[PDB]
Design a protein around this ligand. Sequence first.
Ligand code: SF4
Lengths: 215, 56
Amino acid sequence: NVETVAVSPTICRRGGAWFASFGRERNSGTKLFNISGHVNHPCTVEEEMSVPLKELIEKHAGGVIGGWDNLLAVIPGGSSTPLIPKSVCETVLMDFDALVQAQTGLGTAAVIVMDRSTDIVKAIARLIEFYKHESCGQCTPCREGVDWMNKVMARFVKGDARPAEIDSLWEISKQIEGHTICALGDGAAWPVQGLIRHFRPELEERMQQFALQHQ
Amino acid sequence: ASATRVIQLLRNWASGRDLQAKLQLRYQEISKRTQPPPKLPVGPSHKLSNNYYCTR
Ligand code: SF4
């Protein structure tokens, strides 16, 4: 990676011990963070590795739009990492091991924040559509399964599905993950898994509303 | 059955049983030859999840 290559001369000049002085064990150094979405001051900033997510967002991004209480969800490490809700983002650190423990993964340290005014299902469906548009098509699981998940999420956005289809979509994502040539399939399966895990009630509510107004 | 009362009495006495209660000729008691459509439910394997074939 560009950042990995670029930090190397400074590491050689100042020593590896200086770089390992920052951050926790096995998560050492400093990291570039891109905070975007529903923040007052979206920006790129370099900061110590194991910074709390809330502390980074408030200190550098100017806080969440409408205040910290207005926060709904955060994608911590780019589109390929599962989302986490406010309760997890309250006291979570920003490094590989702590974010893996929060069932997300550090990823590329790209924080995308969403307040309680955004359709989280729509955002996840847009990400899945991106992954459908970006797959190379070489291996069948990624190709066909990501197309399938894109169609299912498009139906989910309107509530045109049934509650039994949520578990089927979960199984489809599991069938994609770990069976592809590269990690694009995993990177498409994980956001769906996170959305299901943390907002199944919202999907069911949307399905009930659509069924009620369509009869 | 379109049988006269006297013939019914004679056949009942001859057989020793009451024939009218259990007749061997079908009448309007049978079902209509035109029926409403059925629905025919599905079996236990029609689930959308947790239904891997290797487990059944
Ligand atoms: S998983 Fe990777 S190799 Fe397979 S189709 Fe998707 S992008 Fe191509």
